[PDB]
Structure 1
Amino acid sequence: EVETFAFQAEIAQLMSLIINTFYSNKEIFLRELISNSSDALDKIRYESLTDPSKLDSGKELHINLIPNKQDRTLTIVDTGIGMTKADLINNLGTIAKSGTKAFMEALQAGADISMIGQFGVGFYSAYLVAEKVTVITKHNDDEQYAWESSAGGSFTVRTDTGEPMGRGTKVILHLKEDQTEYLEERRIKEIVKKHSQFIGYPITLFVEK
């Protein structure tokens, strides 16, 4: 059972801008997704400070980067607080309408796309490098769900039948044909060292057979 939703007009316009604007500094997508993961890990850690049982779904707080050249996917896994189904439909837990408003005023006032994270909509920078994004998420208060969009004005949500996550979020980037450099180990290492050196959670870059 698959539900198809229309993006709010402002969010569709944000992703069309990300997809269509000539902008060579695409590597910042990884910084933005790791920062989102760090924020989600902060949230479940804070909740656990007064309720240890919040970590019954998994005590380890970390970020994994999983490239797969055969599938042409880069997956960012975290064990953060996750998202409910309502969070997913409500723009992945962002205030994306007002954030897009401010981002687009900043762009006409000198800003560039790399500053997208300062407006709370850094997730959508995934479409700098991905033709399709799948988000698998499990929140303590809900079931496991899969969100998916190839842009074009719509997204889908379904109950996920993949591997149980326990708790957290998995962002699967189905990379564009000309963006496979972000599957190479040395390129990912360079980006993490450049932009994510002070993230307070272990970031593990998986290797491939």
Structure 2
Amino acid sequence: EVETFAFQAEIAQLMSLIINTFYSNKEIFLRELISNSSDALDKIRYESLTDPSKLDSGKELHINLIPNKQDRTLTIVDTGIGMTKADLINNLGTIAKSGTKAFMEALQAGADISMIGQFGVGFYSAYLVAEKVTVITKHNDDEQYAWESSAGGSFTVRTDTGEPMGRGTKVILHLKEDQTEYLEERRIKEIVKKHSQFIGYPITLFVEK
């Protein structure tokens, strides 16, 4: 029950650009993923203003950052709106075809990769630091699903039978071997303070034994 899909040509090109372009300022991936979490949390907040039962699947609106040096993963968990299967398949609920075109045009007019989030496709900056990304998500309207991709042109979607998440999205970054600085507490804290210090939801950096 694992379905495999091909990325649209434009998204595959975006991912190859992110993976192959020499670009040292890789830390911006975390700003972009926290930003997407903040957007998802705003969306469930806004739905709850008129239907409070939308928060029956969890009232606390927050983001957790969980490093795991044994597994070489950094995971970003939020309790936002989550995504339906259809959203996951449709480029993680982004307008990535048009976004990708508008990011490319910007790159030719002098922009740099750190501006990716202005084009709606900041999620793909995960591939600056990860060799594989796994996205586990639960929307009130749907079941819990796991999306996954090591790039190379395809992604998978399956029903997830991991731990139930209530509602929201978890992004597991399986980091490249030379990017393990992003598991160190001091480094994560430095990046959060530098780029995400005014995000309007609590961000909890877990520690490890």
Question: CA shift at 1:12, angstroms?
Answer: 0.1
Cα shift at 1:11? 0.2
Distance 2:161 2:55 in 1: 23
Q: How far is the alpha carbon of 1:71 from its aligned partner?
A: 0.2
TM superposition shift of 1:182: 0.1
Residue 134 (structure 1) shift = 0.1
SS at match of 1:56: helix
Alpha-carbon shift at residue 123 of structure 1 (Å): 0.1
**CA apart distance, 1:112:** 0.2
Q: Report deviation, 1:74.
A: 0.1
Tell me the distance in 2 between the aligned counterparts of 1:157 and 1:50: 32
Task: Give, in angstroms, the shift of residue 186 of structure 1.
Answer: 0.1
How far residue 193 of structure 1 moved from its aligned partner, in angstroms, is: 0.1
Paired residue total: 209
TM-fit CA distance, 1:169: 0.1
Query: How do 1:141-152 residues align onto structure 2 when only pairs under 5 Å count?
Result: 141-152=141-152
SS in 1 for 2:179: helix
Distance 2:66 2:94 in 1: 25
- Helix, strand or coil: the match of 2:34? helix
Q: CA deviation at 1:72?
A: 0.1
Deviation at 1:24, TM superposition (A): 0.1
Q: CA-atom RMSD, angstroms?
A: 0.2
Cα displacement (A) at 1:93: 0.1
Provide, for residues 85-128 of structure 1, a one-character-per-residue CA deviation record: whole Å limited to 9, x for no partner: 00000000000000000000100110000000000000000000
Structure 2: stretches of 5+ with no match in the other structure: none
Normalized against structure 2, the TM-score is what?
1.00
Give identity over the alignment, percent: 100
Deviations along 1:184-208, whole A, 9 cap, x unmatched?
0000000000000110000000000
Q: CA deviation at 1:157?
A: 0.1
Q: Distance in 1 between matches of 2:51 and 2:109?
A: 45
Task: Normalising by structure 1, report the TM-score.
Answer: 1.00
Q: CA deviation at 1:56?
A: 0.2
Instruction: Please give the alpha-carbon distance, in whole angstroms, between the structure 1 residues aligned to 2:159 and 2:119.
Output: 30
Which residue pairs with 2:7 in the alignment?
7
Cα separation, 2, equivalents of 1:162 and 1:29:
25
> Following TM superposition, by how much is the alpha carbon of 1:147 offset from its aligned partner in structure 2, in angstroms?
0.1
Distance (whole Å) between structure 2 residues aligned to residue 158 and residue 196 of structure 1: 32
Instruction: Return the alpha-carbon distance in structure 2 between the equivalents of residues 191 and 57 of structure 1.
Output: 30
Q: Any gaps of 5 or more consecutive residues in structure 1? A: none
The 1-side partners of 2:52 and 2:129 are apart by 38
Q: Distance in 2 between matches of 1:21 and 1:171?
A: 23
